[model samples]
Target chain A: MQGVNIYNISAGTSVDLAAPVTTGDIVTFFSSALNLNTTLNLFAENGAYLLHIAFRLQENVIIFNSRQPDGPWLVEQRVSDVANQFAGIDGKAMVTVFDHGDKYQVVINEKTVIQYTKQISGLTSSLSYNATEETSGFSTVVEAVTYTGLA
Target chain B: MQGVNIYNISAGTSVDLAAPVTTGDIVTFFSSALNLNAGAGNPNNTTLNLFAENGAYLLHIAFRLQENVIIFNSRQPDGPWLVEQRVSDVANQFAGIDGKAMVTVFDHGDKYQVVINEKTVIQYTKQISGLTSSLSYNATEETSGFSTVVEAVTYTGLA
Candidate 1:
């Protein structure tokens, strides 16, 4: 699909690759799954930085990032974190994180998230996805994925 | 003189303080000049934080510690330096040096600026005022002083 669409990947959906992803690349997956506590696992080859997104009842959004999906993820609560995770979606409020050589700046709703930066250096080379309903029997929907190139 | 009004203080106008001021208090001043590059020098004992008006020529809205005014002040392009100076106005925005706290946030408006600070630590206790533009020249405006605690009354949102 070109723009926004529906995605159904059942429960265990895993994608593995051999090549390394460059900086400034964004891979997004949207789902209509009406669950807040869903679990999506993403696995990257070695140096991959995993960015995870979870929307609570479509009202609040939570973002998780990791060098790999198995270990602990970095959590942010302030507007800066929100700006980096959600300011990407078209209609939905989202954030865009760009790699400027040695620095990273978060852009929210087409605007910069002020003066915030990532403490850790270098972006993860790979990321995995996993989603599960907070409550049982709920449906999960996904839209699309994109890979953006760093300028 | 009552709520918030912009007046021409005439050239070489001198302001004298009859009382001792403390930090976190909101005050107002007038200028007969309109130069955005004017500097601040105070003869008072208390250290005061200075803020500039956002929509002086258009809105003429008194710069209260009002939420909008605080947010608008923080969002100004020059907001970082001023906000950094006062620190109390945007205590929440100070992200510290290592990103532990909110340091600074900004939004570019069509005509003005919008700065967002979640927290402010330092306080301003003294202030001095003078016109920025030529005496009796273009309209000169001064900002309303706000105390550190008075900011509890301000709020902001996405436009």
Candidate 2:
């Protein structure tokens, strides 16, 4: 019943979980962000950034961004004014990702935020939850992060 | 893109989702009880129950040994039963060959279609799919017992 849980999950605090994510695996997390400032980062084996999902606090927009190895950042898509149906407004945020072979469907606060096609072609070997920068003044606390791997 | 997530839960654990299993809702879970008999004929133990509750409506579904079937039962809190039956796993269906199974309850509006892995196992056709609120899987054993470290139940294809 216990998945990964973390505290003091503020900015630049990354909890690396080196597990391969595949289709049918559920990446579910419930967290509290000070101002919708946290991001979910996915990586390949030996540390290669594959993708990161975060939101624009001011715009209330959820952005999905990914890239190839050392390549330019690619904006997969954005769910604008998502705060209306999203639960991230007051900071109690929830996220779930359904990984398809071709794309990952990102649901933030019970709303479909993004359906992102993979730009990096490898199984995400590690995952981290960070607020991007230590100086961002974003204080995010994570309650639980469960990686449900499918056999 | 849509499904409820229920994870490594064990016996007597009731999850009150409060979200109805509407049409297009896909509910899935992993249970440790492979071949179990906790109802009707058993004297030592009460019937093992998996409950999905909403208002006065309750849906109870689970398995029994030897018969290799699932007891699919539904009822209103006050009155008579809606639909009840024992469905045997025809081939390597519904209940996985292994005692432990990952089950899927797909709401098809008309009924809740149950599947074991990829094979369709049974059906609950009382048309109560709109009444599902939450699920409780309280089976304590699968032969060896219920597994606590396995796939988390997920809901997909619904809002």
Off by over 4 Å in 1: A1-12, A17-19, A33-36, A39-44, A47-49, A56-61, A65-75, A78-116, A119-125, A133-143, A148-150, B1-159
CAPRI accuracy category, model 2: incorrect
Comparing only chain B with the true structure, the TM-scores of all models are: 0.19, 0.68
TM per prediction: 0.30, 0.51
Residue A113 CA error for candidate 2 (Å)?
1.8
lDDT of 1 by residue, B18-59 (tens): 221111111222121111111243211111222223211111
lDDT of 2 at A115: 72
lDDT tens digits, residue span A42-114, model 2: 6777566666777667677767777666677875677777556454346445677767667777776556666
Tens-digit lDDT string for candidate 1 (A2-33): 11111234434544432233344333333433
lDDT of 2 by residue, B1-159 (tens): 354444444455555564555665556565554434433444222132334454444456655544555577776666676657666653345333466555666565676666655455566775243546666555444222345333344455543
Off by over 4 Å in 2: A1-10, A34-37, A85-91, A132-139, B4-49, B52-133, B136-154, B157-159
**Highest-DockQ candidate:** 2
lDDT to native, each model: 0.28, 0.55
